[PDB]
Amino acid sequence: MKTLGEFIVEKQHEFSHATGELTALLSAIKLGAKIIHRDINKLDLFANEKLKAALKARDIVAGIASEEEDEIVVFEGCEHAKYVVLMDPLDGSSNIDVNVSVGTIFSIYRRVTPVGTPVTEEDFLQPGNKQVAAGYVVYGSSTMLVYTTGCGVHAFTYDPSLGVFCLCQERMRFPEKGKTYSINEGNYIKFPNGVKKYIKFCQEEDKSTNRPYTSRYIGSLVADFHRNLLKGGIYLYPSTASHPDGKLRLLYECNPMAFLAEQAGGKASDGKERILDIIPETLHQRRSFFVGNDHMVEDVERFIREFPDA
Amino acid sequence: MKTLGEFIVEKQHEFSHATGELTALLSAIKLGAKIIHRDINKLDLFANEKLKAALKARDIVAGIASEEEDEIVVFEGCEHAKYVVLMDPLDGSSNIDVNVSVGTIFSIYRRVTPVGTPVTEEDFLQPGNKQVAAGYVVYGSSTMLVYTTGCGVHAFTYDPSLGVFCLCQERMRFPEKGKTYSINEGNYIKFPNGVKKYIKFCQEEDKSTNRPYTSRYIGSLVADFHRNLLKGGIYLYPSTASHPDGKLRLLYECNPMAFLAEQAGGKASDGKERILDIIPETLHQRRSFFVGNDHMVEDVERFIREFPDA
Amino acid sequence: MKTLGEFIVEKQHEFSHATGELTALLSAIKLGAKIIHRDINKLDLFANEKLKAALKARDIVAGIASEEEDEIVVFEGCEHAKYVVLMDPLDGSSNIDVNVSVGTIFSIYRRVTPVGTPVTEEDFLQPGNKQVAAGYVVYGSSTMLVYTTGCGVHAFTYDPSLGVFCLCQERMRFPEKGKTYSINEGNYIKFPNGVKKYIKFCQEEDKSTNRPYTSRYIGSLVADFHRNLLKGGIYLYPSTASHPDGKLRLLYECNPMAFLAEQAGGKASDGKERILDIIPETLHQRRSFFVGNDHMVEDVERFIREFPDA
Amino acid sequence: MKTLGEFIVEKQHEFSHATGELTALLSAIKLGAKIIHRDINKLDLFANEKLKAALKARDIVAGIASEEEDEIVVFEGCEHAKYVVLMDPLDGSSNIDVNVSVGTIFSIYRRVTPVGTPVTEEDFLQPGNKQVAAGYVVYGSSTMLVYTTGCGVHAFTYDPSLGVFCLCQERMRFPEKGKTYSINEGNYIKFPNGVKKYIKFCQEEDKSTNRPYTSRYIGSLVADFHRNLLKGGIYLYPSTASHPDGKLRLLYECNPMAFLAEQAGGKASDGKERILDIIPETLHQRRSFFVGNDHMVEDVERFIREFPDA
Secondary structure: OOEHHHHHHHOOOOHHHOHHHHHHHHHHHHHHHHHHHHHHOOHHHHHHHHHHHHHHHOOOEEEEEEOOOOOOEEOOOOOOOOEEEEEEEEEOHHHHHHOOOEEEEEEEEEOOOOOOOOOOHHHHOOOHHHOOEEEEEEEOOOEEEEEEOOOOEEEEEEEOOOOEEEEEEEEEOOOOOOOEEEOOHHHHHHOOHHHHHHHHHHOOOEHHHOEOOEEOEOOOHHHHHHHHHHHOOEEEEOOOOOOEOEOOEHHHHHHHHHHHHHHOOOEEEOOOOEHHHOOOOOOOOEOOEEEEOHHHHHHHHHHHHHOOOO | OOEHHHHHHHOOOOHHHOHHHHHHHHHHHHHHHHHHHHHHOOHHHHHHHHHHHHHHHOOOEEEEEEOOOOOOEEOOOOOOOOEEEEEEEEEOHHHHHHOOOEEEEEEEEEOOOOOOOOOOHHHHOOOHHHOOEEEEEEEOOOEEEEEEOOOOEEEEEEEOOOOEEEEEEEEEOOOOOOOEEEOOHHHHHHOOHHHHHHHHHHOOOEHHHOEOOEEOEOOOHHHHHHHHHHHOOEEEEOOOOOOEOEOOEHHHHHHHHHHHHHHOOOEEEOOOOEHHHOOOOOOOOEOOEEEEOHHHHHHHHHHHHHOOOO | OOEHHHHHHHOOOOHHHOHHHHHHHHHHHHHHHHHHHHHHOOHHHHHHHHHHHHHHHOOOEEEEEEOOOOOOEEOOOOOOOOEEEEEEEEEOHHHHHHOOOEEEEEEEEEOOOOOOOOOOHHHHOOOHHHOOEEEEEEEOOOEEEEEEOOOOEEEEEEEOOOOEEEEEEEEEOOOOOOOEEEOOHHHHHHOOHHHHHHHHHHOOOEHHHOEOOEEOEOOOHHHHHHHHHHHOOEEEEOOOOOOEOEOOEHHHHHHHHHHHHHHOOOEEEOOOOEHHHOOOOOOOOEOOEEEEOHHHHHHHHHHHHHOOOO | OOEHHHHHHHOOOOHHHOHHHHHHHHHHHHHHHHHHHHHHOOHHHHHHHHHHHHHHHOOOEEEEEEOOOOOOEEOOOOOOOOEEEEEEEEEOHHHHHHOOOEEEEEEEEEOOOOOOOOOOHHHHOOOHHHOOEEEEEEEOOOEEEEEEOOOOEEEEEEEOOOOEEEEEEEEEOOOOOOOEEEOOHHHHHHOOHHHHHHHHHHOOOEHHHOEOOEEOEOOOHHHHHHHHHHHOOEEEEOOOOOOEOEOOEHHHHHHHHHHHHHHOOOEEEOOOOEHHHOOOOOOOOEOOEEEEOHHHHHHHHHHHHHOOOO
16 A cells, blocks of 8 residues: 555656655645545535645645635735645535535646745636646545646545545556546537537447447536546536536636646547637636547537537 | 434334334444445445345344345345345446445335245245335445335435434425436437437426426436435436346336335336336346436326337 | 344343343443544533433433432433433543543443333432443443343444444453452552552562562553453452542442443452442442452452451 | 644744654654554554554655564665654553553654665664654554654644544643652562652652652553653653563663653653663663653652662
């Protein structure tokens, strides 16, 4: 058995050789995860407060931005720190009422503003390709932490009896092919024409390409993403008239998940371009999101090009 | 706070006033659930063995039938018992690999054969309407036990820190209307014509009836059933050319879930008739299954009558 | 592995064949123990309230008497019950501050007053020889439950990860000889002359009788008793000028521990007579207490006869 | 609430400002403690192996010396490390069988031999006054970690439900006076004359100095030490004919506990001189040990000077 802390020390080459700093960052995340885990066994504010407090206590983060706050949070006494963290404290918290998987998503960037000064929104509006780390905690049948710093995706499972996260998968990679699609198909009529055509494509009979595909939609970004990463597949959250530019948050959800997806050998697109290369406009900016096996995301992109209407 | 054990003693009117016996039965189930819970934090055989051992140790069950065994199990030294239990020890165990919800389903009947003799398959082939109890354990973000003895559906949540199941919902009831459907829509082309038509019906635009409906499919009978019970909805597992008479087991899955559904004010059909009234043919008999809010199941039945082809 | 509940069902010959009732009684105790266990990982009132509530919820106890209450507690709606329980909810609670072992002690009697009426102090003032059950829960490095119903002493260890008590010792018996004594020797000068002489006797050099004996005094009746039961020894709590008739409670501590000691093959005396045969005078009556290996208790009794002064 | 990890980061002035290193060291200890904690809820080898593995995995310790090994252990690939650790993996493991408190003791030194080379016994034979850190983990009714780096004694309690150690006492100090003594008084006749005289002194009647003192002897160095630190007192483990120079290990037990005692305002002597100033002769060297409130240890020293015979 190898714990998360031991694994970090082992891979002192990742995170720009900043091992001590990564240990601190993930220790704050693991602490918040443990607190949230027990609390699950409203919660949004709770998770937000605990994670925020955990990060501030490590004296390594200058400030944070959260889906649960309109404005960024500048930590007093941490202006010397060079890291900022963006997070979705409790992804899909609505699933708590029905005992369905929920999760925490985090994204880490090196600040751009001068150290020793208060971080500004400029530090939080960098494109996803600037992330130095990203990950999620999935609170399902078991609690797991998955992260990347640009050198592969690593998975750890929390052992409640030992109170520690244990390594369970060092190099998480999408399988060569995907055969599952995840989307709220009930909203079929509301989706762009290209997405509707792709859904029909998924239902055709073609054994040579494993079609029709299997459908799976838990309704939790983290849970669906996690399953598709392990078994192969694609997750889709298109735009609709109600959400013309998508529903998912570009900064708190799309970017970190896109970083993880790419590090696992997958693709993350908004239907037309690479998520990680999008220039952020606002903290709460939304974006259409298609992520998973590259061939599947490529198919969605093709259908959107062939049937451009919304 | 009120524990499962205390609740049972409180409702000494249920289970034909056989309080001591119900306590014994659920104690065996709770024990097995606790063991399985920790083991999750292959498993099929494990869950089967632990539950079987737990039931035998309570000296109240003459024998059991399990999805994990071709033949029934007659407990030596328990021929004096008048109860038999049928179970699906670990529903959707495949979801374990992806950290998705799994569950245990149990069904209890009073034997028909003379006490003091070895139970036979006759005791396990009674129609669902003869069940004296049924329930499930859902191992999700939290572990919960749900059951009925014919007087409503009661829910309990396991508190790992106290090692006990606590009452969380005394009268589980489907809401007045459902607005969510759960099916592997990827297999659309393989389903009977009536089911295909119903799926399209679910996607129409009609705000007056909350359409289009929301789609949710975890891929776990227990997990999807549980969510739909709390929020309203319908779960569908139709027949296909590969499984002409459905995939779900009539005795280990359909009957117990149908009993729970009806006790919560819902409906459980195979598309044409009431699940609980079907006369069992074999231990492993399969059946098409549609369960949830009555109006939704009624709609499926109508579409099947209007479009009868497979 | 065999759980406490399964063990009880197995030994349906004990407790006057009242298996269902014993299960109920110990279930209340185990529940209270679990609650207290987690709360430890002031407390007196807490432990008292939780245990009292647990016993009342099982609808099998007419009332209780506790070291934490001047008057007995008559449970409304339980006048039909035939059992009464006396308890020391949190023995040696002062040890909590220093992380030292503490414990719960319980004693069970069949009421003497007519069923269907409110129990009176008469039901709680019966001599110890009338106990139908007695036991303790020791909250130490691990939490254990030990009990007897007149057919030997059985020990169970709580497994926090499974949330259940597991059998660890079916027939607890004092070894053939004891070689350890447990007393607050600091109060040597305050003890009766016979006790002082016995202490000196314990310190003599005589390998043939394993002397000098080893001294061990945790300061917790339950913890010291438990160790001496497993390894052999004697526990002494004599009278002093401050407590002329002893400090320990005859009904809440001495009687239940004496029942356990005798069932394990040991002896329990007040220095002159058998604890279980003493006729109670009041609910809070105190008594000198010497318990453990028979030969050691016999030695104390001899010294008290030979040196009678206080 | 403040965790051990957060506390360490907070006090970045201690441990020669080597915060990152202290975090690593205590993380290894906390991990081992968690593993041992669950294993308790033979063990000597287990505890030794887990702690040794934990320390090696942090890549910060060049090697260790343990009471469970005749020779020191040089960690391959850690010759670059500048710290060495000495430990008593499972103090009083015999108490496990009786559910009595046990503990882990650790001592940390900066190596004296050149970095980049294999540590030798020279690195492990430094006097106690050279320790840079020392501490213990007490596995009792609750699990606690206590440590010092020369700036006071800090206590933390393990919360099994959160899987983390929480600060509970920042500045542990002996009370102004002690009124409890801890010794195996059964061996009175075997002790040096001065110790026998001190024991009698403890039993005299003198309210002005809180005498007679209370006696408490759990039989576990860590447990007795911990209680005396919180409530005041003295722990004595004298020499005897069987152990002419004491029984406790100078390096694995006496030195670390002496460092803690002094940092809490107490005293630690072998009866004649300061434990921390003794020049080690061998890895397994033993020593008489008297530790606790200064006035009490001073009294023992006086009696030993006044009655010098063994």
